Amino acid sequence: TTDPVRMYMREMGTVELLTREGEIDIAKRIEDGINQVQCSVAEYPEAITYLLEQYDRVEAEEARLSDLITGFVDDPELAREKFAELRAQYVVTRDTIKATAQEEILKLSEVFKQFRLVPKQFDYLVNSMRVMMDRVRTQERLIMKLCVEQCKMPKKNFITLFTGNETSDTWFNAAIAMNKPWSEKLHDVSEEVHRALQKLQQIEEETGLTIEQVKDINRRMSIGEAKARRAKKEMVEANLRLVISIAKKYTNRGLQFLDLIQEGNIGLMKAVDKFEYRRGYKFSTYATWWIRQAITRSIADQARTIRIPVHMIETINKLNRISRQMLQEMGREPTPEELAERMLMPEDKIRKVLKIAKEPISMETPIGDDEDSHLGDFIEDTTLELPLDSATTESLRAATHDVLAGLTAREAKVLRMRFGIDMNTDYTLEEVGKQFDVTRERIRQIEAKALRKLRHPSRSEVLRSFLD
Amino acid sequence: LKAQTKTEEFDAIKIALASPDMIRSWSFGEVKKPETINYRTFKPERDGLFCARIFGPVKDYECLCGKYKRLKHRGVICEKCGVEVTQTKVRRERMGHIELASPTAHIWFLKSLPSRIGLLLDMPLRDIERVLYFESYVVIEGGMTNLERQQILTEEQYLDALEEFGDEFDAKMGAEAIQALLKSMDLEQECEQLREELNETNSETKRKKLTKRIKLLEAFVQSGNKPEWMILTVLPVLPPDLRPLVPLDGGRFATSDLNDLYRRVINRNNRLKRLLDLAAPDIIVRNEKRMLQEAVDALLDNGRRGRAITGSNKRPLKSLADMIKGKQGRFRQNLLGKRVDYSGRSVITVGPYLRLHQCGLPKKMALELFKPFIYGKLELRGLATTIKAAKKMVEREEAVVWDILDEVIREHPVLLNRAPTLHRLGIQAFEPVLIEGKAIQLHPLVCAAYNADFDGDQMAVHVPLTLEAQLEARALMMSTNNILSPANGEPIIVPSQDVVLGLYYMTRDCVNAKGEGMVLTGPKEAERLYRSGLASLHARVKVRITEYEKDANGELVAKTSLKDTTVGRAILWMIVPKGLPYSIVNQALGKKAISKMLNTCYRILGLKPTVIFADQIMYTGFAYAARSGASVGIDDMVIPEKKHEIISEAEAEVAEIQEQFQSGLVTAGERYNKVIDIWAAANDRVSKAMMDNLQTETVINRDGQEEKQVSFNSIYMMADSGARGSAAQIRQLAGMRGLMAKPDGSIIETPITANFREGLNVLQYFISTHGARKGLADTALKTANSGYLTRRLVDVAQDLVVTEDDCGTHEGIMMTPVIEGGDVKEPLRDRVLGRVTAEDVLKPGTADILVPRNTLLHEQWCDLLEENSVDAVKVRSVVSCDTDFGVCAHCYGRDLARGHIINKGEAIGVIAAQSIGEPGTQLTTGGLPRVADLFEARRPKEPAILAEISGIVSFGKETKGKRRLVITPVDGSDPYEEMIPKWRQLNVFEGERVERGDVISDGPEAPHDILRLRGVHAVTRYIVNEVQDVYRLQGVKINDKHIEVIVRQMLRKATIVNAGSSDFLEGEQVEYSRVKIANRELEANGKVGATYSRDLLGITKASLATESFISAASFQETTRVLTEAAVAGKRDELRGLKENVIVGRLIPAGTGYAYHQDRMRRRAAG
Amino acid sequence: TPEEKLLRAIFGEKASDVKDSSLRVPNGVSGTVIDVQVFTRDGVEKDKRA
Ligand SMILES: [Mg+2]
Ligand SMILES: [Zn+2]
Ligand SMILES: [Zn+2]
């Protein structure tokens, strides 16, 4: 029926309400998903050393502790000694790679999982990971396209010696002599593949992981991330009805209905993001605060044609409340200074605050006759300059220009200099002294006589008429 | 040589769709925030609807931050906050844009009545809307699987189709889908297929829509527009100062609604951007996208969906489409229409002393009006040092300035205007005369053209600033240059009332008066006799007079005689110039004769002698009327002595018929009409009684017993002279007044037996009220209706202007006297006057050409036609003129306020409409609505039917609801058989031959037929003769010319029949077409030329088609016009009037006609 | 601007920080003053005349 209010009401009404048990189900799914990515982050060597390089910048006064960690499971001293533990577990696991290492690589993860990272930092890690995987995909697809598409080799036979290695020369130089139909064709592109293999094998140096593992790890991460959003989305969809129930209170506050319910939906999104079901707090009354918070916080900001800071808004509301009771309490209405004593502040601010708080009047407001004459049609232009004046400006130029030719060439130059007449800016009488080489008092005398010469009327009768 | 890049003087204009990059070209920055002003310091918040960085400095030549305040620094972009320091004027120009997250539909192309996106994709509207709201999925580029390209799927159905075919099939939903559709669309391929399919199937239902669609497509292809552009990527923002936030008194602010709208569009948009980076669920981002769609739609044109309401105010906020739109079309040039400087206005008074070329102007008004002229003149002679000192002088009102004003006033015409401007005489130029007092004085003779009474009407003044305007005013709009109505050549300067009452009392004669019988040498000593008190103004006297006749060859002959006349006529002769014979002043000089006097004076001596003549007539009329001491007393109204008896006899009649109804001898209805008839006859009886008594009752004595002449009683002289009053109104004063009518329209059978000289009782007055009330109501409403008529007329004509000199066609229409049922309801001499002969006309014998081929027929030539008995003359008309895109002056006529043939370039369309419209106030089937029906071509309710083709006809088949009529031509094929319902009584004889266009029944006939069956000249003759009947019944003189030009515009379009260049059935300009088959008649194809059929369009329908779209957006519905043009990329070349007025350049007519001509040839040339 | 500044310099006038809003009799109308009323905000000191 269009009217987008309806096509929403009907689109969400399909989603079935969550049972109190179903809520924990979804919340449980979230925990698994995130813990997967947490564990997946713990399994990246570069992810540890980077955190190390960051704390070494913290102890070197190149950063602050607030810009890196939000705290662990569970103060500068505690932070310092906790980071030492991480560094400790890294330096053992590092040298044990000579098979058995795995048991210690498993413990290095555990300690790292205690760190609750700042969201910005966490995002950068994952970004670094996905960017590293782009770097791997670049080389994977290059070596594939340089063989299959260019040199005409089937992909069926291209993957046999790839899996498990994709670094060393077992596949590239030992498979071209096999005399298969696709074998002898691989020589033309050899120069381009083997030189691009550099970054491919370098990744296992930087990241300290064979190209094998590099895909797996962030694949589980991808899976986990998907699961998280899946569940969280699911949760939000279940509680849309709650948002609707809250926004129906705030309707006429000056924002549209669908505007309200959308802003509230974001609040609900935040509520899911920060919710922990292990606390036993019913999800309804926990999200209500977040949803209600978003609505008001939005209404305060954008609902006005002139944005006002929050504290200003709250001030205004307090006045309405008093004016309500005091309307009938006083039998007339509180005097402009009445609410002033009731309110904390200097109390003369009532006038100022009350003025800027007012909403602008529609310039299209019809006034009179019902005719197309509208308020905006009556607002005159004050920034323009009337022609009856502009004519006198062009004249005054011709005036002073005439009267400055009646003087000596230096009096005109000195007077045109001391004022902005036909020149950029103007020059201080000391500056003028530098241009003429005879300086200080000398110039000032000349100025006096110049103004004096225009004072006694022959010159004077024309310029005096400009001041009325 | 290189063309240009910077500012030239543009011709034409183009309109089209806007690319996203094209929108970005105008934008000097993206508005990223709903913020307006800082809220304390009211400076604009940066990157907001009001932004110094994006748009412009708040104050002239000053940086926002304030670092660079000096007027020297100009092209500097401030390093702190980038603001190029420039005039604040640039905040009125620079635009902006907004990059929308999701695509958005343009409400104009979605919801315009012929939905553009819909018929471009050949897709229904409801489906397209269903896809925009994410209420269903639509296929795009379906490939070969299961599915149509435009097919729509549901939730489950899309899912099933995807599991079967993963790829090689594609479907989207929402705005992105439609945009994908439009981009994927290949117009060339669709065009070819549609051409074949058109040919294959023959059905009217099928190919009507078919041809409509194909036209759009090839147009859209030729346009240069790419379909994707109907979906908005980038949204332009209007410059801030066009929706200002400007402060008000008391510190409150006021701003345009667009801000409230624009703000909304941003927020929702921004939120959507946020909702993408937050990975929200589908159900939400979908709702947000719809919300964005609603906001954009509401922004562009509000009211086509939900009608969003402005903040805190119930009244819906006005959107951008409503700024252009309005009532009607555009606000700018439509009434009304912009205020104008150098003007004023006030109450008007008489000023009988004025010459006809001048007017009294209040001192104060002229001072404030000419202020710049006065300032410049004061220091040109050196009475003021500088312009300021001059200002102080006039502000001090120093005595010396008044003489300087006499200089700037002397030769400097001013424009005077009255409230209901109808014909061009509603504005006239005068020479200003400085007058003490605050009232405008207006020459009495002009009071007729303005329809300006003195009961307090106010008039407006305009100063002609530019030199060309002074000379236009003096040579065009001047009072003395228009003395004649453009509607008919009769003088509109005709003396009004007091003046003609003077001349009537002047030349008149009683039976015996002082000086009767004596003789005088000449008019000089005649006045000497009168003024000295010896002789009475009217007495029969022989005096020697010298008259003149120019009957020689360009030479005035003189002849003297003793004329038998009166003293007054003798005195009056002093004014009559030269070549007029004394016969003209020897009569009683009523208002009718006194007009033909001035007319002849104009057609003989020319313009200049007539003017000074007219002045003198006014002066003497007022003067002598004052001497006369005419008055009106209560004893001036003479009631018949026999009235009471007449009432009684008629009173017996009613009781006789009543006695017949009581006894059943007569029916109730028959009684009513009868009684009503006897009372009516009685009124006539009383009227022609008091008229006899009142008219002649002066009975006076010369040397004998008695004699009787026309009465000198005051009120008769008024009515007789033609000054004021008429037999109808007089009848109401003395004799009984009428039989009034009860509200339902019936007429009460007990008339008003009393009159105004006697008293009316309670009932009689109360019954009188309805007539008064209906009178006032009818006029007050019909006044507005008349105006409406002129509106449609000037719209349908307008751009028609005299262009060529002689188109050189022998064609024309046959002008005969109207000869209606009696003798000559209007003569031949009036019908042919001032027109041009189509071909030479014969005497009764031949090889004798009286009037030779095309010659202006003036007063002598028309009298030469009257000398001979010639009853019929064929005359060139504007309807037959061969000139394309205009009328040749040779085909029009002479008519103007001047007697010369119409000049090259005068705009006849306007004056045609004005001439028809101005008298429309006096009209009341029949009346003013009858005229409107005629010009609208409307087919009547129960029309007649004309024989489709000549030859013997007969009746065939039987009664199905139509009893077929079968026509049988002699030589040609029979097959024409028309289905006529037989329950309408026929006329056509079943056994007789009827010519095509004969009467097959009775009743009115649709002029469409008359055009089709009888021909062009026939229908134009029908219109002019019928409409002229309507007007002439009311006594309105309107020359047939004007009606003919409207007619020509009625037939502007025709529908092609044959082919070989353009489309079969297209209605199109006969100008374009005829010029196209005349070009084809030679060169090109040997002859491929196509046959057309002239069409008849009603006035309101014919005005619809105008090449220039800027004109159409004015008086039509703005929204549809802009869209329908924007798709085709139509390029408006101006060339017309309406459009040139909007853009504010010289009208391509009159004084401007030289300009456009000179430019038009420079164009499309080297 | 430059030339206005020279004008004040020659004639030595101090251009005020206040602009003149004073109520003056409309053009052309002339009469006698029959009354004066002074309304004042509550809390601002009434001037002498008031
Ligand atoms: Mg009036
Ligand atoms: Zn700056
Ligand atoms: Zn012609």
Curated annotation (Swiss-Prot), chain A:
Stretch list, region Sigma-70 factor domain-3: 314-390
DNA-binding region per UniProt: 429-448
Q: What are the start and end residues of every segment in region (Sigma-70 factor domain-2)?
A: 235-305
Point out the annotated site residues (description: Interaction with anti-sigma factors): R418
Q: Which domain of life is it from?
A: Bacteria
Listed GO biological process terms = DNA-templated transcription initiation; negative regulation of DNA-templated transcription; regulation of DNA-templated transcription initiation; response to heat
Chain intervals for the UniProt region annotation (Interaction with anti-sigma factors)? 440-455
| Entry's localization field | Cytoplasm
Q: Where is this motif: Interaction with polymerase core subunit RpoC?
A: 259-262
Q: Main localization of the protein? A: cytoplasm
**What are the protein's UniProt keywords?**
Cytoplasm, DNA-binding, Sigma factor, Transcription, Transcription regulation
Statement: the UniProt record of this protein carries the keyword Cytoplasm:
yes
**Domain notes for this protein:** Contains 4 domains, connected by flexible linkers. In the active conformation, the domains are in an extended conformation, each making extensive interactions with the RNA polymerase catalytic core.
Task: List the protein's name.
Answer: RNA polymerase sigma factor RpoD
User: Which residues of the intact protein are shown?
Assistant: 94 to 612 of 613
Swiss-Prot record, chain B:
Q: Note the effect listed for R773C.
A: Resistant to antibiotics salinamide A and B
Reported effect, G775 to A/C: Resistant to antibiotics salinamide A and B
Q: Where does Zn(2+) 1 bind?
A: C63, C65, C78, C81
Give the result of P751 to S/T, as annotated. Answer: Resistant to antibiotics salinamide A and B
Tell me which UniProt keywords the record has, alphabetically: Acetylation, Antibiotic resistance, DNA-directed RNA polymerase, Magnesium, Metal-binding, Nucleotidyltransferase, Transcription, Transferase, Zinc
Q: Share an example GO biological-process annotation for this protein.
A: response to antibiotic
Q: Which reaction does it catalyse?
A: RNA(n) + a ribonucleoside 5'-triphosphate = RNA(n+1) + diphosphate
Question: What does the record say about how the cofactor binds?
Answer: Binds 1 Mg(2+) ion per subunit.
Can you tell me which residues bind Zn(2+) 2? C807, C881, C888, C891
Which InterPro entries does the entry mention? DNA-dir_RpoC_beta_prime (IPR045867), DNA-dir_RpoC_beta_prime_bact (IPR012754), RNA_pol_asu (IPR000722), RNA_pol_N (IPR006592), RNA_pol_Rpb1_1 (IPR007080), RNA_pol_Rpb1_3 (IPR007066), RNA_pol_Rpb1_3_sf (IPR042102), RNA_pol_Rpb1_4 (IPR007083)
What practical use does it have? Co-administration of salinamide and rifampicin or salinamide and myxopyronin suppresses the emergence of resistance to both antibiotics.
Q: Which residues bind Mg(2+)?
A: D453, D455, D457
UniProt GO MF annotations = DNA binding; DNA-directed RNA polymerase activity; magnesium ion binding; zinc ion binding
Cellular component per GO, a single term: transcription elongation factor complex
Co-factor requirement: Mg(2+); Zn(2+)
Q: What is the effect of changing S768A?
A: Resistant to antibiotics salinamide A and B
Q: How is it modified after translation?
A: Acetylated on several lysine residues in the presence of glucose.
Q: Which Pfam families match?
A: RNA_pol_Rpb1_1 (PF04997), RNA_pol_Rpb1_2 (PF00623), RNA_pol_Rpb1_3 (PF04983), RNA_pol_Rpb1_4 (PF05000), RNA_pol_Rpb1_5 (PF04998)
Q: Outline what the protein does.
A: DNA-dependent RNA polymerase (RNAP) catalyzes the transcription of DNA into RNA using the four ribonucleoside triphosphates as substrates.
Q: HAMAP family under this entry?
A: RNApol_bact_RpoC
Protein name stated in the entry: DNA-directed RNA polymerase subunit beta'
Its source organism is Escherichia coli (strain K12)
Swiss-Prot record, chain C:
The source's domain of life comes to Bacteria
PTM statement from Swiss-Prot or TrEMBL: Acetylated on several lysine residues in the presence of glucose.
- Reported uses of this protein in biotechnology and industry: Co-administration of salinamide and rifampicin or salinamide and myxopyronin suppresses the emergence of resistance to both antibiotics.
Its quaternary organisation is:
The RNAP catalytic core consists of 2 alpha, 1 beta, 1 beta' and 1 omega subunit. When a sigma factor is associated with the core the holoenzyme is formed, which can initiate transcription. The rRNA transcription and antitermination complex (rrnTAC) consists of RNAP, NusA, NusB, NusE (rpsJ), NusG, SubB, ribosomal protein S4, DNA and precursor rRNA; S4 is more flexible than other subunits. In pull-down experiments interacts with CedA.
Q: Which family does it belong to?
A: Belongs to the RNA polymerase beta chain family.
Role description: DNA-dependent RNA polymerase (RNAP) catalyzes the transcription of DNA into RNA using the four ribonucleoside triphosphates as substrates.
User: What is the protein name stated in its UniProt record?
Assistant: DNA-directed RNA polymerase subunit beta
Q: Which organism is this entry from?
A: Escherichia coli (strain K12)
Q: Which residues of the full protein are shown?
A: 896 to 945 of 1342
